[PDB]
Write an enzyme that holds these catalytic residues in place. Structure first.
Site, PDB file in Angstrom:
ATOM      1  N   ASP A   1       1.676   1.420   9.154  1.00 54.29           N
ATOM      2  CA  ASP A   1       1.433   0.654  10.451  1.00 54.29           C
ATOM      3  C   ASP A   1       2.260   0.434  11.455  1.00 54.29           C
ATOM      4  OD1 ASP A   1      -0.631  -0.184   8.507  1.00 54.29           O
ATOM      5  OD2 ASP A   1       0.370  -2.254   8.426  1.00 54.29           O
TER       6      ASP A   1
ATOM      7  N   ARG B   1      -3.416  -2.147  10.368  1.00 58.18           N
ATOM      8  CA  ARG B   1      -3.484  -3.775  10.193  1.00 58.18           C
ATOM      9  C   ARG B   1      -3.470  -4.451  11.407  1.00 58.18           C
ATOM     10  NH1 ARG B   1      -2.259  -7.916   6.407  1.00 58.18           N
ATOM     11  NH2 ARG B   1      -0.944  -7.367   4.595  1.00 58.18           N
TER      12      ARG B   1
ATOM     13  N   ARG C   1     -15.717  16.427  13.985  1.00 59.89           N
ATOM     14  CA  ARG C   1     -16.100  16.970  14.927  1.00 59.89           C
ATOM     15  C   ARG C   1     -16.477  18.448  14.793  1.00 59.89           C
ATOM     16  NH1 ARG C   1     -13.486  15.868  20.782  1.00 59.89           N
ATOM     17  NH2 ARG C   1     -11.600  16.725  19.879  1.00 59.89           N
TER      18      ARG C   1
ATOM     19  N   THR D   1       5.660   2.044   5.248  1.00 60.80           N
ATOM     20  CA  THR D   1       4.239   1.819   5.667  1.00 60.80           C
ATOM     21  C   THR D   1       3.844   2.482   6.966  1.00 60.80           C
ATOM     22  OG1 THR D   1       2.766  -0.128   6.578  1.00 60.80           O
ATOM     23  CG2 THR D   1       4.971  -0.236   7.251  1.00 60.80           C
TER      24      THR D   1
ATOM     25  N   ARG E   1      -3.314   6.785   4.155  1.00 61.33           N
ATOM     26  CA  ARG E   1      -2.099   6.646   3.302  1.00 61.33           C
ATOM     27  C   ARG E   1      -1.867   7.464   2.205  1.00 61.33           C
ATOM     28  NH1 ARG E   1      -4.222   0.592   3.055  1.00 61.33           N
ATOM     29  NH2 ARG E   1      -3.863   0.556   1.031  1.00 61.33           N
TER      30      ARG E   1
ATOM     31  N   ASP F   1       4.867  -1.553  12.096  1.00 67.16           N
ATOM     32  CA  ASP F   1       4.826  -2.740  12.604  1.00 67.16           C
ATOM     33  C   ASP F   1       6.180  -3.743  11.842  1.00 67.16           C
ATOM     34  OD1 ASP F   1       4.198  -3.277   9.979  1.00 67.16           O
ATOM     35  OD2 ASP F   1       2.275  -3.868   9.734  1.00 67.16           O
TER      36      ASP F   1
ATOM     37  N   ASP G   1       6.312  -5.516   5.379  1.00 68.14           N
ATOM     38  CA  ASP G   1       6.839  -6.785   5.801  1.00 68.14           C
ATOM     39  C   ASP G   1       6.658  -7.955   4.783  1.00 68.14           C
ATOM     40  OD1 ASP G   1       7.804  -5.944   8.208  1.00 68.14           O
ATOM     41  OD2 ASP G   1       5.952  -6.756   9.439  1.00 68.14           O
TER      42      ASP G   1
ATOM     43  N   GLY H   1       1.055  -1.181  -0.050  1.00 67.33           N
ATOM     44  CA  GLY H   1       0.015   0.070  -0.144  1.00 67.33           C
ATOM     45  C   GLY H   1       0.740   1.325  -0.163  1.00 67.33           C
TER      46      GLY H   1
ATOM     47  N   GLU I   1     -11.704   9.195  24.923  1.00 67.74           N
ATOM     48  CA  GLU I   1     -11.918   8.127  26.144  1.00 67.74           C
ATOM     49  C   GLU I   1     -11.689   7.006  26.015  1.00 67.74           C
ATOM     50  OE1 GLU I   1     -16.482   7.828  26.667  1.00 67.74           O
ATOM     51  OE2 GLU I   1     -16.628   9.887  27.182  1.00 67.74           O
TER      52      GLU I   1
ATOM     53  N   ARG J   1       0.069  -5.146  -6.237  1.00 64.15           N
ATOM     54  CA  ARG J   1      -0.022  -6.405  -5.524  1.00 64.15           C
ATOM     55  C   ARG J   1       0.309  -7.431  -6.500  1.00 64.15           C
ATOM     56  NH1 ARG J   1      -5.619  -6.146  -1.565  1.00 64.15           N
ATOM     57  NH2 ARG J   1      -4.940  -4.516  -0.248  1.00 64.15           N
TER      58      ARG J   1
ATOM     59  N   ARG K   1      19.295  10.179  -5.788  1.00 65.36           N
ATOM     60  CA  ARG K   1      20.624  11.272  -5.592  1.00 65.36           C
ATOM     61  C   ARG K   1      21.670  10.456  -5.007  1.00 65.36           C
ATOM     62  NH1 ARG K   1      17.421  16.603  -5.705  1.00 65.36           N
ATOM     63  NH2 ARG K   1      16.201  16.602  -8.032  1.00 65.36           N
TER      64      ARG K   1
ATOM     65  N   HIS L   1     -19.212  15.410  22.154  1.00 67.77           N
ATOM     66  CA  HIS L   1     -18.143  15.006  21.240  1.00 67.77           C
ATOM     67  C   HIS L   1     -17.093  14.093  21.605  1.00 67.77           C
ATOM     68  CE1 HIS L   1     -19.335  18.448  18.189  1.00 67.77           C
ATOM     69  NE2 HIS L   1     -20.337  17.652  18.539  1.00 67.77           N
TER      70      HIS L   1
HETATM   71  N1  LIG Z   1       6.051 -14.353   1.585  1.00 66.37           N
HETATM   72  C1  LIG Z   1       6.341 -13.587   0.095  1.00 66.37           C
HETATM   73  N2  LIG Z   1       7.137 -13.850  -0.784  1.00 66.37           N
HETATM   74  C2  LIG Z   1       7.523 -13.171  -1.974  1.00 66.37           C
HETATM   75  N3  LIG Z   1       6.666 -11.898  -2.233  1.00 66.37           N
HETATM   76  C3  LIG Z   1       5.912 -11.542  -1.306  1.00 66.37           C
HETATM   77  C4  LIG Z   1       5.697 -12.114   0.030  1.00 66.37           C
HETATM   78  N4  LIG Z   1       4.707 -11.575   0.460  1.00 66.37           N
HETATM   79  C5  LIG Z   1       4.344 -10.286   0.099  1.00 66.37           C
HETATM   80  N5  LIG Z   1       5.129 -10.612  -1.386  1.00 66.37           N
HETATM   81  C6  LIG Z   1       5.193  -9.443  -2.246  1.00 66.37           C
HETATM   82  O1  LIG Z   1       5.182  -8.092  -1.686  1.00 66.37           O
HETATM   83  C7  LIG Z   1       4.012  -7.562  -2.177  1.00 66.37           C
HETATM   84  C8  LIG Z   1       3.397  -6.410  -1.318  1.00 66.37           C
HETATM   85  O2  LIG Z   1       2.973  -7.481  -0.150  1.00 66.37           O
HETATM   86  P1  LIG Z   1       1.902  -7.015   0.761  1.00 66.37           P
HETATM   87  O3  LIG Z   1       1.961  -7.971   1.795  1.00 66.37           O
HETATM   88  O4  LIG Z   1       0.668  -6.796   0.053  1.00 66.37           O
HETATM   89  O5  LIG Z   1       2.469  -5.328   1.321  1.00 66.37           O
HETATM   90  P2  LIG Z   1       3.404  -5.070   2.654  1.00 66.37           P
HETATM   91  O6  LIG Z   1       4.797  -4.922   1.804  1.00 66.37           O
HETATM   92  O7  LIG Z   1       2.926  -3.532   2.757  1.00 66.37           O
HETATM   93  O8  LIG Z   1       3.493  -6.266   3.725  1.00 66.37           O
HETATM   94  C9  LIG Z   1       3.064  -8.584  -2.473  1.00 66.37           C
HETATM   95  O9  LIG Z   1       1.897  -8.534  -3.549  1.00 66.37           O
HETATM   96  C10 LIG Z   1       3.971  -9.692  -2.982  1.00 66.37           C
HETATM   97  O10 LIG Z   1       4.523  -9.216  -4.438  1.00 66.37           O
END
Ligand SMILES: Nc1ncnc2c1ncn2[C@@H]1O[C@H](COP(=O)(O)OP(=O)(O)O)[C@@H](O)[C@H]1O
Ligand SMILES: Nc1ncnc2c1ncn2[C@@H]1O[C@H](COP(=O)(O)OP(=O)(O)O)[C@@H](O)[C@H]1O
Lengths: 322, 322
Positions: A129, A173, A156, A127, A254, A131, A103, A11, A189, A72, A25, A217
């Site tokens: 997230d 996520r 608000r 990202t 994003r 994470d 990840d 994303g 809250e 993706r 650069r 609110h």
């Molecule tokens: N286990 C994996 N092995 C190889 N490629 C992967 C794997 N997981 C994700 N990818 C590649 O990375 C792309 C983006 O991964 P995704 O999990 O959608 O996003 P993020 O990088 O935010 O975790 C996937 O569409 C795929 O091409």
């Protein structure tokens, strides 16, 4: 290290552009040729690979999203398919690949490095997230935080004076960090996150008490990783009368220009990626840990969870809301 | 630790309000009575001291400036005068004093603690400058950074398409951090800061080269601690023809709603201040160092400079601008 490619995967995250700019650069400064891969790993398979110059990244530091694009590409999980990507890089003499994303993106990078000793790979943590193991902050987290503050303010500012409760769904996520920082930031809250067991009855008793004291609110802020804002609302209504604005903030989190935290972080990590490539390193993700720029192996990045949700910050938020 | 007072001292910094809120709510949570001192140390001398409740800090986390107010109180450098401030606190049974502000504010706090063993004092680093020993970031720095980005954007968005050079003066007092982060953040050609020896002839040769390549809307960003934007312009014009927009960003850099980084930092440090008071501590400033919330004695805070200007980040900025 004569030729580098760079790609953005997963994303969008504010600061991806700044990270690409710093890679391009820094590379060229060091007399390295740098190629942009368009549409993430899809472009890698389609050979959508083009030489970049100093000017290809002009007017980009402030831009949201990614001028390379992203996709993706689920077929990249297949080894046979990755072979084509590896051939498209190798036929060009590419010796290093920088992947900016989350990840999942890193997993693609690890496989490449395992399957082709001739290509060094470095991950940059693009990202919202927050994470990714071994960096305290990901590129986009700070931006997303302020985006959420701004979105809350507008909800608000545009609401009926008499609305009592805003149930707002945040991204993140599986990680509650965005919801936690945003919650504290807006004076929520209640904060609902996957790391803390949610007590609905407590939450509704708090809404009801404050509604009884004439409080308007009020906000419940909800990480998507724990539940949706509508399920939260439905679950609360099992004790109390409530549904006053269910809001799903959605993909806009994003979007938008990165904050200065993100521009600077992006820039430091993009340049560091290129430094590492020049130093012979591979199969590492770069980050900021304890205020130091560091590199962590993908194996360690994927070996655990590598540090707690800050329960003490969660507690402070709840204390401040009382 | 039965009664605490809290005050804001020196120039405004976004997040002062959030810090006061965290002190007040944390105190009351712990059954501590908390008094607001209005107009900084002046209020202390005038006995402008009032009990705060939970609601006194409602609707404040997002507010810029300081609802207590601030003053400059130069007479507080005199011991005899501080005696009156100490008596106004002691007659009320105040056992702890939290001071939010910069390095100068801390000095007031140290003296108090030296001159009255019965009052514990804790400093919270509320300033845009980023120039307090033992915290990596001060409360307001992140806000001021984004404020500068936004100001730069508007200058450029409202300028003639043909303006070639914007010489923009940033705050920071004697510390170049704001100018450095902002510069990198906006893609400045040049950054002028007190920690680096300024080479005008180099700077003008860079302007002139780019002007020769048809480059428009270039920016020189200048820390007030090194020189004024007008002196920079005057000095550049000793080599080249230039004066295209001298801009002094001025006190607005202190205004405006804190960013989420600042809200959260403020909140953590305000609560920590109260924790420390409850633990018997005194004569310490609180901060974030290497991503850990810490307390440093005022003696160590005032003993040196305690860590470098980041020359490597300065270098990265210059590399990215090429
Ligand atoms: N286990 C994996 N092995 C190889 N490629 C992967 C794997 N997981 C994700 N990818 C590649 O990375 C792309 C983006 O991964 P995704 O999990 O959608 O996003 P993020 O990088 O935010 O975790 C996937 O569409 C795929 O091409
Ligand atoms: N050396 C000192 N001793 C006692 N009080 C001081 C000292 N320096 C500053 N102060 C007090 O702090 C106030 C604010 O300090 P100033 O230096 O203006 O701001 P900052 O806290 O941002 O450094 C001063 O007006 C004065 O009351």
């Amino acid at each position: 290290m004569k030729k580098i490619a760079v790609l953005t995967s997963g994303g969008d995250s504010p600061g991806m552009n700044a990270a690409v700019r710093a890679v391009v650069r820094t590379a060229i400064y060091n007399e390295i040729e740098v190629y942009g891969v368009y549409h993430g790993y899809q472009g890698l398979l389609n050979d959508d690979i083009h030489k970049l110059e100093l000017g290809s990244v002009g007017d980009t530091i402030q831009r949201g999203g990614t001028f390379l694009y992203s996709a993706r590409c689920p077929e990249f999980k297949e080894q046979e398919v990755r072979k084509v990507a590896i051939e498209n890089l190798r036929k060009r003499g590419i010796e290093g690949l920088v992947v900016i994303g989350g990840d999942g993106s890193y997993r693609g990078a690890q496989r490449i490095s395992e399957e082709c000793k001739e290509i060094q790979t470095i991950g940059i943590p693009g990202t919202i997230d927050n994470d990714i193991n071994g960096t305290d902050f990901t590129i986009g987290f700070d931006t997303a935080l302020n985006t959420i503050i701004g979105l809350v303010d507008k909800i608000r500012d545009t609401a009926s004076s008499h609305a009592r409760t805003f149930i707002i769904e945040a991204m993140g996520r599986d990680c509650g960090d965005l919801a936690l920082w945003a919650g504290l930031s807006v004076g929520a809250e209640t904060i609902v996150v996957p790391e803390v067991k949610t007590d609905i009855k407590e939450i509704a008793d708090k809404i009801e008490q404050g509604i009884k004291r004439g409080k308007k609110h009020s906000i419940v802020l909800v990480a998507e990783g724990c539940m949706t804002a509508q399920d939260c609302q439905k679950e609360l209504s099992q004790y109390i009368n409530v549904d006053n604005r269910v809001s799903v903030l959605g993909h806009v989190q994003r979007g938008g220009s990165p904050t200065g935290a993100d521009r600077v972080l992006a820039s430091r990590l993009g340049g560091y990626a290129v430094d590492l490539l020049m130093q012979g390193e591979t199969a590492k993700g770069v980050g900021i840990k304890n205020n130091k720029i560091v590199a962590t192996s993908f194996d360690e990045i994927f070996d655990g969870k590598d540090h707690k949700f800050d329960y003490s910050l969660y507690e402070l938020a709840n204390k401040l809301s009382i």
